[PDB]
Structures are given as structure tokens and as C-alpha cells.
RNA sequence: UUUGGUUCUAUUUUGUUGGUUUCUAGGACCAUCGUAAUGGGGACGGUCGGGGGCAUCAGUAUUCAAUUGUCAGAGGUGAAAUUCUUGGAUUUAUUGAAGACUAACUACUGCGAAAGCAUUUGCCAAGGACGUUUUCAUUAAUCAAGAACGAAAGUUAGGGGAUCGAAGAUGAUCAGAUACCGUCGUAGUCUUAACCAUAAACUAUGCCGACUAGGGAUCGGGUGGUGUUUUUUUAAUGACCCACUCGGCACCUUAGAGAAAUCAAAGUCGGUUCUGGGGGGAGUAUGGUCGCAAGGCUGAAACUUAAAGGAAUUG
RNA sequence: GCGGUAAUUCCAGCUCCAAUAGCGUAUAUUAAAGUUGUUGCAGUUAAAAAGCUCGUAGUUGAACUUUGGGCCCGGUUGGCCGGUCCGAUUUUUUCGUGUACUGGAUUUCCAACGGGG
RNA sequence: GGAUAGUGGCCUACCAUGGUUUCAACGGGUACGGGGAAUAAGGGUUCGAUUCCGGAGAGGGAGCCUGAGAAACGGCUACCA
């Protein structure tokens, strides 16, 4: 039904996978290049194409973690008045943790990086 | 840790008086001086004291001005803000 | 008890905990004693008028 | 968390607030829940508007239910995916003594308690109807 | 409902069992912080008189008795009158006023 | 899964054991042939703000200072005095350095997890909103222990130190004041470094989710309808006429509950944890852990009492 | 809480009576006391919401099953006697005694079951 | 390996350094454990005992003969009370 509808509006399969991939493979990006087009030919992907695969994603929620952090480290480690800022630092590190405890259980490797991936990317 | 409990860094030479206060400010200074540093040249973990003021990279061997016990303060970081506030503006 | 004899009930065993005086049991006795309004009663509403 | 709980709640209040209908979002023991509830005539029917591909899946019940009071005097929920209570085949602990009816979800299918008997059985008590 | 916890599994229930022992208000395995005890008798050599409450008046005639069970109380005495010799040994309920 | 091979198993036809070799099922090794290997949070675009850190910058004090000018008071309160005061004050004008705080603005107001946070202004970087239907497609939700932050005031090193300001100094009160009241005054207030782990940390309402009444508009955005102000005249908005949605807010305000007073949840009965004990003894003893210490955490007994308490009434 | 002089509570005997070959009193224990709350209770002001957060060992399980089957269902298989319950009856009676019957959680092994977690 | 009626760090050589515990181990205190006893409508609390059953003793503790069987109240050895 959801997948029917928009099935009628786009163009047709084989030639989706070949529109997506190409954004994708240039970096990252899952989001952004679903919104490009003719969004109505995007707009079938959930609904239809497994999902591809892909580098990034499951190392993205981490990656930007980390990327935070070094810049609030900085901060915190001038002056002290910080008060607000370190529960935050404390806050991200740590929703890469609530993150990688169900991201860990379908892969081999996630469990390796996730807990060396902080403080090191 | 070592075997130590609280954290001594260098308070084992004292042996055991000196008290809280007078060897928390000669424990800071000085395992901060021996800290490693990043030199701002290469960017290793190279530098440490040639003596007092003077800090060496051992990499590099780019010798530079500091403070005494450490690397750095802020106060050097303050001065050096300030003049090139002054400076930009000036400059326009 | 005596309240029972005159509902025109004999025998009900009625647990009633959580205070001593008096007013306030006979004031909460006439609630449960007027509007009986659950099952069978409830399948024989149907019928109108007055 | 779940949804169960608050489809006893919400009927029963409204039973109370006296309305036309109820809607809510159904879930998935939620629509197997209801369905015996109505066999026994407490309830008309209910539909999901929008059974197939959709994202929540919603519920509107039709009520039996005013004109003049009822049918489902009180649905209070003991367990219904609430509270673990449990319930053996020989221990038969329930309110109401008769006149109202226990829902036991069991190994085989649904029922009430007095065909559970007959099977024998046991499971946990979902709700009470007075 | 129930009670708080839906009795799950997967080693839970076991928080409450902690909370009926610690919490016990009264005195615990019997009494013997000073007593107890059906008869103990006594054998006590004072006799001296204390005061009641603050809303009354009144004296009463008391007999301190030191106990076997070593302590020193004061008793109160039961009947009007009284007389009591050598030491004696007399028998003493442990009643709560 | 069908169909053949190659290795293992393999009574055997042989009394017998024996030496020597396949193919059939099973297992193994496979080729042929013939079907699957599968699905709250984030992401992008975005907006507010008083989210935090640093810098910049303003003014408005008073003190201090420099200077004016000029007499006999000023200061302060119920009343006074202490104080200040002819060596020229104070009040007054201007200018500088210092100097703490952000009046007016600031509102039933907004934001941070909370504690809290308000000059404008710049720099780095976070977070909740919406709108998307992109990803995990229910991924989730709470949690003793663990760990993080955590006002103020204390504490400690070092800089600055204006009014203020315990303690403490004189004065008045007054029976007594170490009191309120007045003057004076130091650490402190403040800054960077490091500790404290507590408050009436309050929304006296732990936190997560579902339903269950409306009503006035407040802020953010989004769907806008509409035209006007308002700009400019293709055109789009900051506010606005005028709805709707989403998140918070709070009041106004339901009735089933709430002792109650009240609440709209503190309602209808949830997920989860901590924790309660009649009051005084007691958030105390003792031991442990931690802390520089203050003290904080953890945590009662002998004993004593017929009450403590809440709310609502009538005096 | 009674006794500050005409005491409904002392002290003496009449009377009234609960109970009655027993009776209360003390101690121990339990009910009531939903006052250890599972059934059966609180945390705005009653003792009591942890200041708040980040996470876990461990509570729970998002739109109609299908395999397996531990928790599930459905039928059979063990628990001494004594005691407890139901009756004969047996000793002049009777408790005792006494016979016979009826029930027993739990666990074992076993047909069969598939909503849920 | 030895031992014993027979399990076996029960005991003992050598090699490994282990194994347990936030689901409570180790440790401390408690005015036999089960079958059962009274409560109370049920639920649980309480109680665990003299009797039945199994366990442990004989003033305290260790060892040993005899005997099928004892680590023995009515056996010894023998220190101590």
C-alpha cells in the first residue's frame, strides 16, 4: 500500500539503486541523498531496497561523538567555571555507549572499535 | 595504580611529615613539568625540563622559554591574547 | 450490626478497617445501599416508559 | 511503555465521562486481548482503521454502551500487561463471587474462567470484570 | 493493582525480603535487655517510697528489690498493706504499667 | 532436493579365517541440476535563548585622587549619641584610576540534565523545538552498586581589594544588650588554581509511558487563510487580522479522586527505583569509608511518654 | 483516669453478674494491627520522592505467527504412622480407643499443547 | 601412586596457580533438620521440640582391640576435670 503508491509515481527499479549509489560512494550520507531528485523516486527506498550497503552509519554515531568531544575538552580544560559544559561532555561519550551495547550484538568488529572509538577518531 | 593508595607523585622523598597543603604544591608543579608535552613545532610528546625555564624537544631540538615548573601557564597564554588584540587593530 | 438487622439483611460479614467513630460508618453505610448497579439487573434494563 | 493498561482504564473511565466512542492506538497482545471481552457482551465491535501498512495501527471502539448505562459495569485491570500476578487451576482467588467473569490468557487460546475450568487451566488474570 | 513489581524474572523479587528484616520496630529475638521471665524472684533490702505522674499526686509504698538476674529496680507493691522480712525473696511478675 | 564419482563404513559367496576389488543407503568429499541467505534514538535542513568558556565594550556609583569654589555644619534616627568637623569638612562642578554590578530593561518571562544563568558585542562548540520519512524500524524504557556535575558558606595558595561586611571596637536602649537601632571594621564578597558534597537543591510534587474537560494568550517553529500596517511595486517578510498543529509554560478553571486545603493530575489502575516507620532520645552513639579540616555519608540502644502530628472548624 | 469529705472506680458487707470444677493473672506467641502490606498500605502538608543526571547485574517488552518448547495447557504415576476432617461404633458413658472413608501442597517420570515471554 | 568394603587433595609426590563472590561466597551471631504443631476465613506469620524419621553424644578430647557391623553410656588405652 505505502510501497504500492509510490511505486506508481517514480521510475523503476534497477534504475534506483543506480541513482542512490552514486551520492553515496562520494561520502556518507544516507539522509541527504534522499533528498535530492525528484523525491518521489527517493521516496520508495525504505519502502523497497533492503537498504545498501554501506561504509559509515553504524561508525557515524560514534565518529561525531568523538568529534564533539575533542573540541569541549579543550574548554573544559581551560578555565574551571565550566559548570554547564562537562555534564554535556559526559552526556555524548556516553550516548555512544547506550548506542553501542544493541549496535554491538548483530556484528563481529563493533565490538572491537566501539570501545576503543573514544577518544581516538 | 603502583602500589601506592592516594597519590604521593613525589611525596616519597619527604618519608612522611611535610603535611597536606605544603607537598600538594610541590607535588603539581613539578609532575606537571615532567608531564609529557607536545611540542608545538613537531607536535611529539617530546619536551621535557633542561632545567629550570628552559624546555628542549627532544625530537626537534628546539629549545624554548617557559615557565619555570611548567611548559606554560595561562598567564603567558593572557599576554599573548592581549598584544595581538592590540595589534590587530592597528594593523585594520 | 444493629444497622444490618434493619436493612432487613441478617448475615453479611462487612470489613469495614480504617476508623473508630461513628457519624462518618453510618454516612458511608446508604452509598453501597442504594445503588446496586452492576450484572444481571444491568441484561434487564431493556423496557421503557413511565 | 505497553498499551494494554491503558485500554482498561480509558474504557472504564469513559464509561464514567459518558461518551459516544473511544479511539486509541492498538498494539499487538493489546487486539488479541479484546476480542473475548466482547463475545460475552460487554462490547459491540471493534474495528482498526487501517489494518494494513501503517505505522501504529488505531482502534476505534464501538461501545455498548449509552442510551441508558452499559453492559461492562467495571474493567479493572489486575495484570493486563500491568502486574504479574498469577493464577493455578486449584487456586481460584476473584471478586464478584457471581455475576462477572475472569479472563485468563492460557496455553491454548483465550476463554473465560468458567470454560477454563472445564479445560482446567491457568495463566494470569488480565482483568477483572465485576 | 498488584503490587509495584510484575514478578518477571530473571533474578528480581528478591529487593523486598530485604526490606521486612531491617525494619522490625519493637524488641527482636525475645527480651533480656532486663527481662523477661514468668517468676524471678528477687531478695531485696530497700524499702523506700517514689512519685507517680504529673498531672496527679499520690505516694506509693515501693520496695526496691535487687534481682538474681543481677539488677536493682524499683517494684511497686500489689494489695493494700504490706509486711516483708529478712531479705525476703519475693516473686515478681515483669507486668507493663 | 534429484542424478553420478572419490574416501569411510561394509554380515556377505566362503566351516573357517584369510589376501585381494566396486557400487547402494548413511557420514564425508563433491560435480550436475534445482530454491533463500531477508526488516526511543539518530541523521539532514532548521530556530530561540539570559545553554557554557574566553575576549571585547558601555554606563551609571561611591571611594580614592586631582581641582574648583566657600561657611559652620555634617552624619543619623523614635529620640539621640558614637562618628565626621575649623589644620577649611560636607554638599557642588569637572577629570582620572581603581572598581564591583548589570538599574532602566526583565514580563504568570525564556533556557540548562539539574545547581543556575541577564551590559551590549565577537570568537569555538553543545542542546531541546519543528519540518523531513532518510536509518536502526521498534531499535526501547528505568537501575542499588559504580561515575559525573552540584548554590552559598567554610577551607587553602597566590593576585586584586571600591562600597559592603561577621567577628569585634566605641555609642544609645535598657534592669541587662554580647540585641534590634547607628557609626566603624577584617577575612569574606570577587578573580585563576584546588577542595567541601550540603541547602526551604522547592514545582515541599523522584523519573519513564498510556488515557482521561474545556477556556483566555505567552514563546519558539511549521501548515497557513487573508489582507493590512510595512517595506519595496516580479516579489517576500519583523510585528499584526485570523485559525490550526507540535513541545514547554503557567494561570483560569472540570467533575472522579483527594483528610483536607486542594489537583487536573496528586485523576483513572503503568513501567522502574530509592525509601518510610508513634513522637522525644536521634539523623545521635559506636565502628567503617571519604575529607586538609569543618563535617558529610552510612546509622541506633537503654530509657521515657498517652501522646507527637496534619487539615479543617467554633471561640 | 478515680480519692481536694455527703466517691458509680478506695476500704467492709449487701445486691448484680460474667463465668463455673473452673477461673483470671503473668510470661511466651498469634490475631485484630492492611502496624513488614503477596492477598493487605504510605511518600504536596501525615514517618516518607533519593538534588539531579550517565549507565548496568537485574524488573518490563513496540503492526495479525511460523519452527523449537524452559516458563505455558492437558491427562496419568508419589507423599509412613500419628495428628487434622467425615461416620460405625467400643469400654455403664465418654475423651481416649477404635475401624473404615476422604482429602495433601510440593517433586519425580510420561501422551499432548504453541497466545504470551 | 598409596589407602579403603568402595568416591576421591581423604593423605601424598610432581606439574598447573588456581577456584568463589554485587544471584551475597568468607566470615560473625542465633534466648538439631524434616515429618509436623497452634493461628487465622484465606494468605502468610509463628514454631521446629519431648513423640515418628534421620543426624550427632555420653564429664571434655584423641586413638584402638574385639566383632559381620562399634570409632562404643552398660569396653579399653590414657592426658586432663
Given at each position: 500500500?505505502?510501497?504500492?503508491?509510490?511505486?506508481?509515481?517514480?521510475?523503476?527499479?534497477?534504475?534506483?539503486?543506480?541513482?542512490?549509489?552514486?551520492?553515496?560512494?562520494?561520502?556518507?550520507?544516507?539522509?541527504?541523498?534522499?533528498?535530492?531528485?525528484?523525491?518521489?523516486?527517493?521516496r520508495?527506498?525504505?519502502?523497497?531496497?533492503?537498504?545498501?550497503?554501506?561504509?559509515?552509519?553504524?561508525?557515524?554515531?560514534?565518529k561525531?561523538?568523538?568529534?564533539v568531544?575533542?573540541?569541549?575538552?579543550?574548554?573544559?580544560?581551560?578555565?574551571?567555571?565550566?559548570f554547564?559544559?562537562?555534564?554535556?561532555?559526559?552526556?555524548?561519550?556516553?550516548?555512544?555507549?547506550?548506542?553501542?551495547?544493541?549496535?554491538?550484538?548483530?556484528?563481529?568488529?563493533?565490538?572491537?572499535?566501539?570501545?576503543?572509538?573514544?577518544?581516538?577518531? | 595504580?603502583?602500589?601506592?593508595?592516594?597519590?604521593?607523585?613525589?611525596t616519597?622523598?619527604?618519608?612522611?611529615?611535610?603535611?597536606?597543603?605544603?607537598?600538594?604544591?610541590?607535588?603539581?608543579?613539578?609532575?606537571?613539568?615532567?608531564?609529557?608535552?607536545?611540542?608545538?613545532?613537531?607536535?611529539?610528546?617530546?619536551?621535557?625540563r633542561?632545567?629550570?625555564?628552559?624546555?628542549?624537544?627532544?625530537?626537534?631540538?628546539?629549545?624554548?622559554?617557559?615557565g619555570?615548573?611548567?611548559?606554560?601557564?595561562?598567564?603567558?597564554?593572557?599576554?599573548?591574547?592581549?598584544?595581538?588584540?592590540?595589534?590587530?587593530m592597528?594593523?585594520? | 450490626?444493629?444497622?444490618?438487622?434493619?436493612?432487613?439483611?441478617?448475615?453479611?460479614?462487612?470489613?469495614?478497617?480504617?476508623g473508630?467513630?461513628?457519624?462518618?460508618?453510618?454516612?458511608?453505610?446508604?452509598?453501597?445501599?442504594?445503588?446496586?448497579?452492576?450484572?444481571?439487573?444491568?441484561?434487564?434494563?431493556?423496557?421503557?416508559?413511565? | 511503555?505497553?498499551?494494554?493498561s491503558?485500554?482498561?482504564?480509558?474504557?472504564?473511565?469513559?464509561?464514567?465521562?459518558?461518551?459516544?466512542?473511544?479511539?486509541?492506538?492498538?498494539?499487538?497482545?493489546?487486539?488479541?486481548?479484546?476480542?473475548?471481552?466482547?463475545?460475552?457482551?460487554?462490547?459491540?465491535?471493534?474495528?482498526?482503521?487501517?489494518?494494513?501498512?501503517?505505522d501504529?495501527?488505531?482502534?476505534?471502539?464501538?461501545?455498548?454502551?449509552?442510551?441508558?448505562?452499559?453492559?461492562?459495569?467495571?474493567?479493572?485491570?489486575?495484570?493486563?500487561?500491568?502486574?504479574?500476578?498469577?493464577?493455578?487451576?486449584?487456586?481460584?482467588?476473584?471478586?464478584?463471587?457471581?455475576?462477572?467473569?475472569?479472563?485468563?490468557?492460557?496455553?491454548?487460546?483465550?476463554?473465560?474462567?468458567?470454560?477454563?475450568?472445564?479445560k482446567?487451566?491457568?495463566?494470569?488474570?488480565?482483568?477483572?470484570?465485576? | 493493582?498488584?503490587?509495584?513489581?510484575?514478578?518477571?524474572?530473571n533474578?528480581?523479587?528478591?529487593?523486598?525480603?530485604?526490606?521486612?528484616?531491617?525494619?522490625?520496630?519493637?524488641?527482636?529475638?525475645?527480651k533480656?535487655?532486663?527481662?523477661?521471665?514468668?517468676?524471678?524472684?528477687?531478695?531485696g533490702?530497700?524499702?523506700?517510697?517514689?512519685?507517680?505522674?504529673?498531672?496527679?499526686?499520690?505516694?506509693?509504698?515501693?520496695?526496691?528489690?535487687?534481682?538474681?538476674?543481677?539488677?536493682?529496680?524499683?517494684?511497686?507493691?500489689?494489695?493494700?498493706?504490706?509486711?516483708?522480712?529478712?531479705?525476703?525473696?519475693?516473686?515478681?511478675?515483669?507486668?507493663?504499667?
Open positions: 500500500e505505502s510501497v504500492i503508491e509510490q511505486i506508481v509515481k517514480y521510475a523503476r527499479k534497477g534504475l534506483t539503486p543506480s541513482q542512490i549509489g552514486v551520492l553515496l560512494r562520494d561520502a556518507h550520507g544516507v539522509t541527504q541523498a534522499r533528498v535530492i531528485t525528484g523525491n518521489k523516486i527517493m520508495i527506498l525504505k519502502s523497497n531496497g533492503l537498504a545498501p550497503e554501506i561504509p559509515e552509519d553504524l561508525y557515524y554515531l560514534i561525531k561523538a568523538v568529534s568531544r575533542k573540541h569541549l575538552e579543550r574548554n573544559r580544560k581551560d578555565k574551571d567555571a565550566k554547564r559544559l562537562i555534564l554535556i561532555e559526559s552526556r555524548i561519550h556516553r550516548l555512544a555507549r547506550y548506542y553501542r551495547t544493541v549496535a554491538v550484538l548483530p556484528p563481529n568488529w563493533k565490538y572491537e572499535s566501539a570501545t576503543a572509538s573514544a577518544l581516538v577518531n | 595504580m603502583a602500589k601506592r593508595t592516594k597519590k604521593v607523585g613525589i616519597g622523598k619527604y618519608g612522611v611529615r611535610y603535611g597536606s597543603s605544603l607537598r600538594r604544591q610541590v607535588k603539581k608543579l613539578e609532575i606537571q613539568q615532567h608531564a609529557r608535552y607536545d611540542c608545538s613545532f613537531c607536535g611529539k610528546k617530546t619536551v621535557k633542561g632545567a629550570a625555564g628552559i624546555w628542549t624537544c627532544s625530537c626537534c631540538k628546539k629549545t624554548v622559554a617557559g619555570a615548573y611548567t611548559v606554560s601557564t595561562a598567564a603567558a597564554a593572557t599576554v599573548r591574547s592581549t598584544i595581538r588584540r592590540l595589534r590587530e592597528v594593523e585594520a | 450490626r444493629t444497622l444490618e438487622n434493619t436493612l432487613k439483611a441478617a448475615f453479611v460479614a462487612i470489613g469495614n478497617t480504617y473508630f467513630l461513628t457519624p462518618n460508618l453510618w454516612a458511608e453505610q446508604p452509598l453501597p445501599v442504594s445503588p446496586l448497579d452492576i450484572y444481571s439487573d444491568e441484561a434487564s434494563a431493556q423496557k421503557k416508559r413511565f | 511503555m505497553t498499551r494494554s491503558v485500554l482498561a482504564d480509558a474504557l472504564n473511565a469513559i464509561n464514567n465521562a459518558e461518551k459516544t466512542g473511544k479511539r486509541q492506538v492498538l498494539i499487538r497482545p493489546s487486539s488479541k486481548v479484546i476480542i473475548k471481552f466482547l463475545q460475552v457482551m460487554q462490547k459491540h465491535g471493534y474495528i482498526g482503521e487501517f489494518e494494513y501498512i501503517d501504529h495501527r488505531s482502534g476505534k471502539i464501538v461501545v455498548q454502551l449509552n442510551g441508558r448505562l452499559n453492559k461492562c459495569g467495571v474493567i479493572s485491570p489486575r495484570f493486563n500487561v500491568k502486574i504479574g500476578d498469577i493464577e493455578k487451576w486449584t487456586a481460584n482467588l476473584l471478586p464478584a463471587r457471581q455475576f462477572g467473569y475472569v479472563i485468563l490468557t492460557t496455553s491454548a487460546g483465550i476463554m473465560d474462567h468458567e470454560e477454563a475450568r472445564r482446567h487451566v491457568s495463566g494470569k488474570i488480565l482483568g477483572f470484570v465485576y | 493493582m498488584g503490587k509495584g513489581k510484575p514478578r518477571g524474572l533474578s528480581a523479587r528478591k529487593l523486598r525480603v530485604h526490606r521486612r528484616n531491617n525494619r522490625w520496630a519493637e524488641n527482636n529475638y525475645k533480656r535487655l532486663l527481662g523477661t521471665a514468668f517468676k524471678s524472684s528477687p531478695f533490702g530497700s524499702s523506700h517510697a517514689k512519685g507517680i505522674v504529673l498531672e496527679k499526686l499520690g505516694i506509693e509504698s515501693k520496695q526496691p528489690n535487687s534481682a538474681i538476674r543481677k539488677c536493682v529496680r524499683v517494684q511497686l507493691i500489689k494489695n493494700g498493706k504490706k509486711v516483708t522480712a529478712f531479705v525476703p525473696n519475693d516473686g515478681c511478675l515483669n507486668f507493663v504499667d
